[PDB]
Amino acid sequence: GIQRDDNGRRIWRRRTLTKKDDMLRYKLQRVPFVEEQVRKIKEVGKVMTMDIERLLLSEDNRFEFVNSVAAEATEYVEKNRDEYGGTKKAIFHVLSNRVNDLGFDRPEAYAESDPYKPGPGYLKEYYT
């Protein structure tokens, strides 16, 4: 059990994977060309879609989850009436908070600006 050398320090067997794992070499690689996809997903809003499902994974009844979200969203707007009207939505703020409560990081209410917007009067036309 306990083993020490002359200096008095403790020497222990470094537990290491003796055998070899096939899947280890087949899964550590990452694709290099998803920069446009990840940017599109965030801009579209599918990042919340995964978060919405993730919350439902730890839930027992999806009808109770939406009632709890609606109840908490109503609580948010009552406290701060002049915050959840435009770029920030009461429901999205609840969802962002509930994800942040799990220990992950999301922007507040999933709100995103347009860094490339030229002027105040220029609104982004959508290419249908």
Binding site: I2, Q3, G8, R10, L17, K19, M23, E59, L102
Partner: protein
């Protein structure tokens, strides 16, 4: 104050674990958030990689998929989830020929040995990170030299009773006439002892809902057994049924600082003898360790509870930190004293300080006797451990168990001392 001007470039016993340890799990959809695995002479352990800022609800620390675990029902019939035993396999007859309530560890040991033989099973890889026969701290592997040094006739008798039960089970089910697929699982009697030791020291019983079925499973979760034990845990185990993921969640509204160890309570409340019998380790701060005492002498526990800022019902005894300010003395060890010490209390009857002072020394007069009963002292044992350099780890645990018990007696001696004088104010 620029980063170039700033020049940033202890705990030597703890080294970062093998990266393959997390990698072999990471490929199997195992995610650890904000924590890292560190190993040392004591063993493995999970330590925070960053400050865990508290949130409204519990924060997810680790996730373990069901398929990586070994699970067996606690109640007959014995059905294995992530089913690994094929129908008609002779290992099921060995498992099914076990005591329904006493041989839970044996049924897990058979699965544990069976899993190591399976080529596709994940535990054949994770088994390399399990402690060996010498590294495991279970008392089931200890010999009479460590058991005699343990100095506990009740605990030694129980341990030696288990050794006979486990060894005889191997003899019955691993004779010369077994098929090779069974014989190769336990080539020698010693290996099966190690298998039972791992099963006892790493089983995590829990009520889990798998699909539409709810049951109690003697589970063998990997990466979650590595969490050490503490009666004041900073995290707990939560089973998520929709995706069959076992979540390790830190307590809600609790901050975890950088480098702090993540611990869970293996048992809700138990004495050190139970922990030694099951897990082969003891804690001096156990709030459930007891000591036989004569009922002739008793004190007012309400005064005793308040002087150390202990509040709540006896089922929920706990200490308040900010009220005491610093109070480095108070810990979980003195909380056990609030239960095991003979006490008296009326509706609101105040105690007599002189009578208690007449009894505190009388109480402490007895307290010196138990320490005298053990030939060695609390500091003598820990000094021996530092001087010791070649011995089995079960010997060290046996030293620790009697050392913790002696300190538990030593702790209450000081506890009554400070309590007696503080009663005047």
């Amino acid at each position: 104050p620029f980063p170039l001007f700033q020049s940033p470039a202890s705990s030597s016993e703890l080294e970062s674990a093998d990266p393959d340890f997390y990698k072999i799990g990471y490929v199997r959809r195992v995610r650890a958030y904000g924590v890292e695995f560190k190993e040392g002479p004591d063993g493995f352990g999970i330590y925070a990689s960053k400050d865990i800022e508290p949130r409204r609800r519990a924060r997810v620390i680790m996730e373990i998929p069901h398929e990586l675990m070994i699970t067996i029902r606690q109640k007959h019939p014995w059905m294995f989830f992530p089913d690994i035993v094929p129908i008609g396999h002779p290992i099921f007859d060995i498992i099914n020929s076990t005591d329904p309530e006493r041989d839970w560890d044996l049924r897990l040991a058979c699965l544990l040995l069976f899993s190591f033989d399976r080529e596709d099973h994940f535990w054949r890889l994770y088994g390399d990170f399990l402690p060996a026969a010498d590294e495991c701290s279970s008392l089931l592997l200890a010999t009479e030299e460590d058991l005699a040094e343990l100095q506990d006739p009740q605990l030694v008798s129980t341990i030696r009773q288990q050794q006979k039960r486990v060894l005889e089970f191997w003899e019955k089910n691993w004779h010369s006439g077994v098929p090779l697929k069974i014989k190769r699982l336990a080539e020698d009697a010693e290996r099966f002892i190690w298998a039972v030791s791992i099963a006892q020291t790493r089983c995590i019983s829990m009520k889990t809902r798998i699909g539409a079925l709810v049951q109690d499973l003697n589970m063998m979760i990997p990466y979650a057994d590595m969490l050490n034990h503490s009666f004041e845990p900073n995290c707990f185990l939560h089973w998520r049924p929709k995706d069959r993921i076992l979540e390790v969640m830190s307590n809600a509204g609790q901050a975890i600082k950088k480098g702090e160890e993540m611990t869970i309570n293996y048992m809700p409340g138990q004495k050190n003898n139970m922990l030694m019998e099951r897990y082969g380790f003891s804690t001096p701060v156990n709030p459930w360790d007891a000591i036989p005492f004569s009922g002739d002498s008793r004190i007012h526990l309400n005064s005793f509870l308040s002087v150390f800022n202990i509040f709540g019902l006896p089922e929920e005894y706990y200490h308040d930190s900010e009220l005491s300010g610093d109070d480095s003395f108070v810990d979980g060890a003195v909380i056990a004293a609030a239960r095991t010490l003979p006490t008296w209390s009326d509706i609101d009857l105040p105690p007599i300080p002189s009578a208690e002072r007449k009894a505190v020394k009388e109480l402490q007069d007895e307290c010196r006797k138990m320490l005298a009963e053990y030939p060695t002292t609390s500091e003598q044992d820990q000094k021996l451990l530092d001087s010791l350099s070649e011995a089995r780890t079960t010997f060290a645990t046996a030293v620790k168990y009697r050392m913790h018990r002696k300190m538990f007696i030593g702790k209450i001696i000081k506890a009554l001392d400070i309590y007696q004088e503080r009663l005047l104010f």
